[PDB]
Design a protein around this ligand. Structure first.
Ligand SMILES: [Zn+2]
Ligand SMILES: [Zn+2]
Ligand SMILES: [Zn+2]
Ligand SMILES: [Zn+2]
Lengths: 1464, 107, 51, 62
């Protein structure tokens, strides 16, 4: 920190190096061999000593040694100008668009000019005048075109000058993401008109079309003999696919770029080109290579063998082929076959420079195990450069080890081993106050722990203390304040690198870091006698760690700016609530839970010696736990027989001592997890009660001091602050450890046993399960009457069910839900009642009821039975033979044979049901291995877009370049980790005085206006209740909300309108030393102190609050796409074709259920295949085909599908026979390369002969007009055609002819009404059609989940409301609460362009930051788009500031600290 | 405003920008069967004059190309007939704060 | 601290005129001088002393 | 026209699973439980608690 930097980098320009790289490097490289004998580097070779010092030789350029040479660049002269393979697609577009006769493009002189004149406007920040340029129009002569060109260009000289005379644009031009969209639409369109033309327009003589291959060649295909005759009519006024040599592309494109300089001055420049350079075509080819410096091209080594570098093997091969084409360059100076090797050399001088840059753009020779990587393969992967060594560096001053538990250190502490404590050092500058301690550190030296390893002198020279003795350290600790002779370093002072101490801090890290609470900041507490990092149990739920061998990374920060941020921003005390939903994550975990159900029990009675021992066991005044410096106690609750204290009265005493004395006690009314009936008749131990800081009723659980919301530790966090709530977890961590050591807790075999009364109960209920398998199987086969299992008419149906995946799904669901009832009858009769040991003594139940460990499902499977072993949602799989195991009869309708385990883990499971339980055990393990890979990439993909998104100082949520995303954070600007008790008005009234001197208003009413926002709020409250019966579109807009008028942190009373409604609803239904006027003043100051802070990274948090709970929903089927694959269509990929799109149609309240079910059938599509029983085709042989149809009975398809027989006549005779002959003719063209009814009337005869005339070969036709049971016709083909699979043709056409299809809609269904909502669910989306159904549908309430189809019909704000409703449906299914403030910020990012943009490459394409895009994926693809743009990176996104090493602009880099000097 | 029945021949679409002061908006009457702004998911859109547009950009210190965007062919931008450069004000009911005023510009 | 100051913090020499890191060079001095820092592609060779 | 039950009806399959956990929103005792295994062979099962009458989704980790 004593070597400051002055000048700093602020923006990076991309460009192309010209031909005069030769000026910066006169150290050309010719000899391809890198060394010679005697190990020396040969001159002119790739290890030349003018490229940097090498092999203990000085540099020929720097004159410096290997430690201090920077290294320098050389260059390889390519003999012929090969093209750069990055820019090869972007010259093949300009090659395929230029006319070889006139050297323009194949667009007109005015249409080229128009894109040249709109892109000039868009390199300024003005988009409106570009669309108003096409407004300038009016036997075309070339004088009226040159008027228009001087008329359009006159407008652009005025529109730019007007906006520059205003403040709309600057001289360097305005450029934003929405301007980037409109430029990437013209240039993509400009490369679509130029690409698709045939002839020139300033002449007629036109060029032959081109061709290419895999990036090595370009061909000029033969212009056919029609078009040369179209050329020579004008020019008067060779073989097939001739090759194009690389130099003759340059001689075309040099002359084109000289002519179209105007349009290409704005295609290639997105800011105004102040340097007024020229876009030249040499920039696409490669005149020279450049050799990287020798330091970047060092030899490789492994074991004891040195090898040559990768970047020399690809780069000598260019230089031998450069030599080999000079070897053959002498074979024309004295002068067929040698041009077959000359042209062979140009392909391989191209294919070597192509294989130098890329490696996938070559051909190679053989399977050389993915051959030698080029310079693009060093950049584009997970590994490589831009993601492994710029976003993912390795660090100094860091240690990792296995973690171990400790309840004796604090919650905000780590136990550093003495192995790590004598290695990690901190550079501490020696001053007048730490000289007494840094002298002692140097005396101890680098072996004794309060010590130091080396000192740093004022000239920066280090002096290591390791080899020194006790005398060279004492005689060097005495010189720490001696000023040096030098005057340049008279400012500085020495730095002693002391060891880590108990006042240092540390970033700690669990390695899958899915959210920001997995990397917190601890205080060091150095322990003896260990080698393991050592942690407290409050932290192990935050890191998601357990003590099974997990390792954690310990980082030790090396300056005072970072120590002020591991103590104040990332410490564990401020990480009590997670930002995902506002729920606490820090609390006591397993056995401190199960000790508070015994300590705070009603049986606990401690004597005087014991009561004072549990106080001082956890609260020590010496270590600063108290607030009074004298431990105060309580009177006993029993006086006369013997003085005894209650166990609840200890929890009172520990809160009496650790809370501040001036504040009054806590007041809380909460619940437990333990029901009242486990304690006896008339107990009240479910009600937790704190009155004035005294626990008066109820035991303490996971629900009080665990990681649970609105407990006692969560409530102390609100009233007293995070520093007190972190002490109470430490005090209770020591209280329930000394009580455990004095009074232990065990779990034995007797805990797991049912009594003989209750063990007869589970036998009698499981006796009634032997019939359950058949009865569910007799139900799905639609038999009855208890048909026996060996019935041959039953076993035939079970085989029919077995072959279908549908029917086996029904039989599984019926039988599983029928045997889960018997599972639920055994549990609901036994587990409180049939057990041998009742609740307090039965520790197996008390670990499950308290929430200490396990559930009631674990206790039921131990004591009662396992239950149904459901596999992939369905049931146990089955062989081909109808056997689920070889032990069972085929098609066995036993419940046990389907996988129902009637055994428990106490008594044992049989070998058959041990095999099904291993099936269920493995699907929980293969699904885990595929779990984390799914949601890992979903979180990475969010944290690049939503990554420079932060709260600004005007409370608007903005991106890094300044583009606005939201206007407040969620509409209320409230931090999620603050709004927990904000709507808990009963809690804030019971603790009014203790909460008053926290939100202290007395020292605050002179820095903020008070009455301006309260006055405006009552106008907007009174006006809004007068208009509440109106719908939302008839809402008058006089009074915009008070947050949009007043800053919430500047004006008291400016308050989100939902908080104001809840606050007035509380004060008007609750009349309770506290007024209502002063309670308004508290809860409006509390809104003002719970606001989001400016600089808060709400983009990372919103992405970590979605990707992290999505590692929790990887499971299978429990109709709509569920869980992560639904979440990968909305968020990722922006699917315009959802797999299962739906539509929810709210029917009216006067349309009946029959008229609803009738309306369902009038929507769903009806194929012609859905009314056919059989199709009998008789082929006799001219050829014939008598196609006979059998429909179902007319009272069956008119009832199931609402299809009359007059429809089938019109469907077959207008649609089917046309489609049928379009398939028969198509096949032949790809081949020659009961009863009887006759005596038709006049209607049927006229129907026949007309349709014969309308078709080609049908010749007979009849349809059942009386009953609607059969159609009948006779396709006669020719007397020449061979065999035709007619029945395979007819089955494909019957399944594609529709009788009645409203388009894009497959099926309507009437589900169960959820909460009275009579709705209809439609498999498919068509909003346009459902508007025509207003007699049955509330069309102003129809709701889809195809976001791309709500966007097209209803617009961008309706689509944005769909996204927040469809991400919510994913998480609310899995009972996962995420806050809507995260979901609104994800939705307002995806709708930032008016469109529905994804989080992927294609959504990221319209952005400003180039390094954000390069670091994500396809690095050199985005690099191509940036270099051609000559794009100035502004270095504002956090992915671009870590590259250049600039300070990040989010959080503590969102402002500047300026020091105020007193003298003039 | 010109309300047609089935379609417009694209030879006749060229006459729409043919007048510089006056604009022409087209609507198919099949689309106009339901007023889309009566739906429960479409908030209240209000176009701002250039008096309170200019005072909006002063409050947040914005360029015009930094607001959230609404497309020119959006069915709500076609409903209000928004020209390019007009900031519409969206009053949407947030699920956390009740009423909430947002803005969005037509480009 | 983590991604710059404790991993690969180096202070380099950058020409303010061309804006490049790689093409700088500490000059081999004349024997009566001090080795200064000079950029190479902004530099013109001394034979180009044209009038 | 097949001879087995090819589809489930609208209200002819109710969940058999029931365990007497108190529903923290309306006070119901019956509750359909649902256990699927998330993590590897270092962590147990995680139970999904869906109530009967109201239908509030609830989740207990361990
Ligand atoms: Zn050197
Ligand atoms: Zn031409
Ligand atoms: Zn320079
Ligand atoms: Zn309930």
């Amino acid at each position: 920190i004593s070597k400051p930097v002055g000048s700093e980098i602020t923006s990076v320009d991309f460009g192309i190096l010209t031909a005069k790289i030769r000026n910066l490097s006169a150290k050309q490289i010719t000899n391809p061999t890198v060394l010679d004998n005697l190990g020396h580097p040969v001159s002119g070779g790739l290890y030349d000593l003018a490229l940097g010092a090498f092999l203990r030789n000085l540099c020929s350029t720097c004159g410096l040694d290997e430690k201090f040479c920077p290294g320098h660049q050389g260059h390889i002269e390519l003999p012929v100008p090969c093209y750069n393979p990055l820019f090869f697609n972007q010259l093949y577009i300009y090659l395929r668009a230029s006319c070889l006769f006139c050297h323009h493009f194949r667009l007109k002189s005015v249409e080229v000019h128009r894109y040249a004149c709109k892109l000039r406007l868009l390199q300024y920040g003005l988009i409106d005048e570009s669309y108003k340029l096409d407004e300038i129009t009016l036997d075309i002569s070339s004088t009226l075109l040159n008027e228009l060109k001087s008329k359009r260009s006159e407008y652009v000289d005025m529109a730019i000058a007007k906006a520059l005379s205003d403040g709309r644009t600057t001289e360097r031009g305005s450029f934003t993401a929405t301007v980037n969209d409109e430029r990437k639409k013209l240039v993509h369109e400009f490369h679509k008109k130029l690409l698709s033309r045939g002839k020139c327009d300033n002449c007629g003589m036109f060029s032959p079309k081109f061709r290419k291959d895999g990036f090595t060649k370009i061909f000029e295909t033969a212009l056919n003999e029609k078009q040369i005759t179209n050329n020579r009519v004008k020019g008067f006024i060779k073989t097939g696919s001739t090759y194009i040599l690389s130099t003759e592309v340059k001689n075309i494109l040099d002359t084109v770029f000289r002519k179209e300089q105007c349009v290409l001055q704005y295609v290639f420049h997105s800011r105004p080109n102040l340097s007024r350079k020229l876009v030249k075509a040499d920039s696409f080819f490669m005149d020279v290579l450049v050799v990287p410096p020798t330091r970047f091209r060092l030899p490789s080594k492994l074991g004891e063998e040195v090898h040559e570098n990768s970047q020399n093997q690809l780069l000598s091969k260019v230089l031998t082929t450069s030599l080999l084409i000079r070897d053959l360059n002498d074979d024309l100076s004295k002068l067929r076959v040698i041009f077959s090797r000359l042209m062979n050399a140009f392909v391989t001088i191209q294919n070597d420079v192509n294989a130098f840059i890329d490696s996938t753009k070559a051909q190679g020779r053989t399977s050389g195990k993915v051959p030698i990587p080029g310079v693009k393969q060093a950049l584009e992967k997970k590994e490589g450069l831009f993601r492994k060594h710029m976003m993912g560096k390795r660090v100094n001053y860091a240690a990792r080890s296995v973690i171990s538990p400790d309840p004796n250190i604090e919650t905000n502490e780590i136990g550093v081993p003495p192995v790590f404590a004598v290695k990690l050092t901190y550079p501490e500058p020696v001053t007048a106050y730490n000289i007494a301690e840094l002298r002692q550190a140097v005396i101890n030296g680098p072996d004794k722990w309060p010590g130091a390893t080396q000192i740093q002198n004022e000239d920066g020279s280090l002096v290591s203390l390791i080899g020194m003795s006790v005398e060279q350290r004492k005689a060097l600790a005495n010189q720490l304040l001696t000023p040096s002779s030098n005057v340049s370093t008279h400012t500085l002072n020495k730095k002693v690198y002391r060891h880590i101490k108990n006042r240092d801090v540390v970033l700690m890290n669990r390695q899958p870091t899915l959210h920001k609470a997995s990397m917190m900041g601890h205080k060091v507490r150095v322990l003896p006698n260990e080698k393991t990092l050592r942690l407290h149990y409050a932290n192990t739920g935050a890191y998601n760690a357990d003590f099974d061998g997990d390792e954690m990374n310990m980082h030790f920060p090396q300056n005072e700016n970072a120590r002020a941020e591991a103590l104040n921003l990332a410490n564990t005390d401020s990480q009590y609530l997670t930002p995902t939903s506002g729920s606490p994550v820090r609390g006591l975990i397993q056995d401190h839970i199960s000790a508070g159900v015994w300590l705070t029990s009603k049986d606990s009675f401690f004597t005087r010696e014991q009561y004072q021992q549990y106080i001082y066991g956890c609260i020590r005044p010496e270590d600063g736990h108290t607030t009074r410096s004298k431990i105060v106690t309580l009177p006993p609750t029993i006086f006369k027989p013997y003085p005894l204290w209650t166990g609840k009265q200890i929890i009172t005493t520990v809160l009496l001592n650790v809370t501040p004395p001036d504040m009054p006690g806590i007041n809380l009314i909460s619940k437990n997890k333990i029901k009242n009936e486990y304690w006896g008749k008339g107990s009240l131990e479910n009600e937790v009660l704190f009155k004035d800081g005294a626990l008066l009723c109820g035991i303490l659980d996971k629900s009080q001091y665990g990681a649970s919301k609105y407990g006692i530790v969560h409530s102390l966090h609100e009233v007293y602050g995070p520093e007190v709530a972190a002490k109470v977890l430490s005090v209770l961590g020591r209280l329930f450890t000394n009580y455990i050591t004095a009074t232990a807790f065990t779990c034995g075999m007797d805990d797991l046993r049912l009594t003989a009364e209750g063990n007869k109960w589970r036998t009698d209920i499981l006796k009634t399960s032997v019939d359950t398998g058949r009865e569910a199987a007799a139900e799905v086969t639609n038999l009855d009457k208890d048909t026996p299992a060996d019935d041959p008419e039953l076993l035939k149906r079970l085989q029919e069910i077995l072959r279908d995946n549908n029917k086996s799904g029904i039989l599984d669901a019926v039988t599983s839900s029928k045997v889960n009832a018997i599972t639920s009858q055994v549990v609901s009769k036994c587990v409180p009642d049939g057990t041998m040991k009742k609740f307090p003594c039965n520790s197996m139940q008390a670990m499950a009821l308290s929430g200490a460990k396990g559930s009631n499902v674990n206790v039921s499977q131990i004591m009662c039975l396992l239950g149904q072993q459901a596999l992939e949602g369905r049931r146990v799989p089955v062989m081909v033979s109808g056997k689920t195991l070889p032990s069972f009869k085929p098609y066995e309708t036993d419940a046990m044979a389907g996988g129902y385990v009637k055994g428990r883990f106490y008594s044992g499971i049989k070998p058959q049901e041990y095999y099904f339980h291993c099936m269920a055990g493995r699907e929980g393990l293969i699904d885990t291995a595929v779990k984390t890979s799914r949601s890992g990439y979903l979180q990475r993909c969010l944290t690049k877009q939503l990554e420079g998104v932060h709260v600004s100082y005007d409370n608007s949520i903005r991106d890094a370049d300044g583009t606005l995303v939201q206007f407040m954070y969620g509409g209320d600007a409230i931090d999620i980790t603050k709004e927990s008790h904000m709507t808990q008005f009963e809690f804030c009234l019971d603790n009014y005085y203790a909460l008053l001197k926290k939100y202290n208003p007395s020292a605050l009413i002179e820095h903020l206006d008070v009455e301006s926002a309260l006055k405006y709020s009552k106008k907007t409250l009174k006006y809004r209740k007068k208009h509440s019966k109106e719908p939302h579109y008839k809402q008058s807009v006089k009074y915009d909300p008070v947050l949009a008028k007043y800053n919430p942190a500047k004006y008291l009373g400016s308050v989100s309108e939902n908080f104001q409604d809840k606050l007035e609803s509380f004060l008007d239904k609750n009349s309770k030393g506290v007024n209502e006027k002063k309670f308004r003043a508290l809860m409006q100051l509390k809104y003002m102190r719970s606001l989001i802070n400016p600089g808060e990274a709400v983009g990372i948090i919103a992405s970590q609050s979605v990707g992290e709970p999505s590692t929790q929903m990887t499971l299978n089927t429990f109709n709509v796409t569920l869980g992560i694959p639904r979440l990968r269509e909305i968020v990722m990929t922006a699917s315009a074709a959802i797999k299962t799109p739906q539509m929810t149609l709210p029917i009216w309240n006067d349309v009946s259920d029959e008229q609803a079910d009738t309306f369902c059938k009038s929507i769903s599509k009806v194929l012609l295949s859905e009314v056919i029983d059989k199709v009998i085709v008789t082929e006799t042989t001219a050829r014939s085909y008598v196609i006979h149809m059998r429909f179902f009975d007319n009272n069956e398809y008119s009832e199931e599908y609402d299809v009359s027989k007059e429809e089938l006549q019109n469907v077959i005779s207008n649609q089917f026979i046309h489609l049928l002959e379009a398939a028969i003719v198509k096949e032949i063209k790809k081949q020659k390369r009961v009863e009887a009814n006759n005596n038709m009337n006049k209607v049927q005869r006229d129907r026949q002969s007309a349709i014969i005339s309308h078709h080609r070969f049908i010749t007979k036709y009849n349809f059942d007009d009386e009953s609607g049971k059969w159609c009948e016709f006779k396709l006669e083909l020719a007397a020449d055609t061979e065999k035709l699979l007619m029945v395979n043709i007819v089955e494909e056409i019957c399944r594609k002819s529709i009788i009645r299809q409203i388009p894009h809609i497959d099926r309507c269904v009437h589900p169960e009404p959820e909460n009275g909502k009579r709705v209809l669910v439609t498999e498919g989306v068509n909003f346009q059609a459902m508007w025509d159904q207003e007699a049955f549908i509330d069309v102003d309430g129809i709701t889809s989940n195809d976001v791309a189809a709500v966007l097209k019909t209803y617009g961008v704000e309706a689509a944005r409301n769909t996204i927040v409703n469809e991400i919510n449906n994913v998480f609310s299914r899995y009972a996962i609460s995420v806050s809507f403030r995260h979901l609104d910020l994800i939705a307002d990012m995806m709708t930032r362009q008016g469109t529905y943009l994804a989080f992927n490459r294609q959504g990221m394409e319209t952005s400003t930051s180039s390094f954000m895009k390069m670091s994500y994926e396809t690095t050199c693809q985005f690099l191509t788009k940036a270099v051609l743009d000559n794009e100035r990176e502004q270095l504002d996104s956090p992915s671009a500031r870590i590259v250049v090493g600039k300070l990040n602009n989010v959080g503590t880099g969102s402002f500047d600290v300026l020091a105020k000097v007193p003298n003039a | 405003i010109f309300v047609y029945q089935n379609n417009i021949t694209p030879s006749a679409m060229k006459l729409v920008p043919s007048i510089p002061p006056a604009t022409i908006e087209t609507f198919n009457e099949a689309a106009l069967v339901v007023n889309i702004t009566h739906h429960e998911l479409v908030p209240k859109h209000i176009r701002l004059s250039s008096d309170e547009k200019r005072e909006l950009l002063k409050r947040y210190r914005l360029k015009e190309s930094q607001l959230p965007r609404i497309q020119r062919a959006d069915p709500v931008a076609l409903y209000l007939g928004l020209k390019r450069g007009e900031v519409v004000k969206i009053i949407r009911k947030s699920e956390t704060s009740g009423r909430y005023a947002s803005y969005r510009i037509c480009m | 601290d983590r991604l710059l100051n404790s991993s690969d913090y180096t202070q380099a020499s950058v020409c303010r005129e061309c804006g490049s890191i790689l093409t700088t060079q500490q000059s081999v001095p004349r024997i009566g001088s001090i080795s200064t820092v000079c950029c190479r592609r902004c530099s013109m060779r001394f034979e180009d002393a044209k009038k | 026209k097949s001879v087995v039950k090819t589809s489930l009806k609208k209200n002819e399959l109710k969940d058999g699973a029931t365990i007497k956990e108190k529903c923290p929103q309306c006070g119901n005792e019956e509750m359909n439980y649902h256990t699927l295994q998330l993590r590897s062979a270092d962590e147990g099962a995680t139970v999904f608690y869906t109530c009967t009458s109201c239908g509030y989704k609830f989740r207990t980790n361990n």
